[PDB]
């Protein structure tokens, strides 16, 4: 997250931190995700496409820090890694993935002060352009940074119309109706590398809702180059069927 503010998991308790174990034993951060039911985390396909083996991954819930334990956190193996069959690839189409989570003890997520689910939107129901939404992740704080922040961050961006995002000087044909663009009016805050898979959350008629999933963008916090998010309200049947797997 470029700009914005440091936060803790109490302020985004559906946030899932996803890591990959390497040959040799080392573990690295991959992407964010969102807990949508006790056994299911939703994320982005692009995070996993090069290493689609479920055994490689570790998922944490209730975690506020990248490389240290947070009191009350839970650790999970990935029981099933489901990628969207129509994925294509910088402007990724159908960039959505599901992770079924199971602990070494064979259990799913147990809700607590630091672990909660996020509601899915109603079908084809999105907030109007100009609406403020929040994004959360452990991604870079500056485009030129080598390291990820150690502490979770969040910021606020505003929804951009498909009409505006389709302009040549924005993204042109790269952005489809199954995607949502969001940015800061001064381009001063944005998601960045390592924020992929994480939640874009808007209040849709009073309730917090998973509007989008961090997917792609050209650079970070650059003029005329918004963040692009998978439009969750356009994938409800896909989510519905695959969460029975």
């Amino acid at each position: 997250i470029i700009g914005g503010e440091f936060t803790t998991i109490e302020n985004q308790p559906w946030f899932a931190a996803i890591y990959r174990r390497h040959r040799g034993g080392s573990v690295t951060y991959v992407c964010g995700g969102s807990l949508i039911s006790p056994c299911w985390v939703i994320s982005a396909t692009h995070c996993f496409i090069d290493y689609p083996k479920k055994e490689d991954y570790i998922v944490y819930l209730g975690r506020s820090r990248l490389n240290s334990n947070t009191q009350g956190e839970m650790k999970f193996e990935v029981e099933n890694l489901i990628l969207h069959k129509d994925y294509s690839a910088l402007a990724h189409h159908n960039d959505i993935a599901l992770l079924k989570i199971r602990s070494k003890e064979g259990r799913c997520a147990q809700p607590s002060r630091t672990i909660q689910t996020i509601a899915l939107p109603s079908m084809y129901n999105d907030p109007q352009f100009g609406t403020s939404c929040e994004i959360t992740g452990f991604g870079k704080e500056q485009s030129t940074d080598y390291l990820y922040p150690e502490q979770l961050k969040m910021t606020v961006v505003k929804l951009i119309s498909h009409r505006e995002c389709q302009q040549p000087h924005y993204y042109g044909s790269e952005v489809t109706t199954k995607m949502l663009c969001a940015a800061d009016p001064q381009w001063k805050t944005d998601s960045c590398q390592g924020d992929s898979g994480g939640p874009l959350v808007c209040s849709l008629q009073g309730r917090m809702t998973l509007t989008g999933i961090v997917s792609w963008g050209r650079g970070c916090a650059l003029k005329d180059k918004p963040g692009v998010y998978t439009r969750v309200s356009h994938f409800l049947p896909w989510i519905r069927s695959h969460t029975k797997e």
Binding site: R20, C31, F48, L90, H92, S196, V214, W216, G227, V228
Partner: peptide, 14 residues
């Protein structure tokens, strides 16, 4: 480069 952008995390070429 592209390997430093959203969309290319956990990629073989990066």
């Amino acid at each position: 480069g592209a390997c430093s952008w959203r969309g290319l995390e956990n990629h073989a070429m990066c």
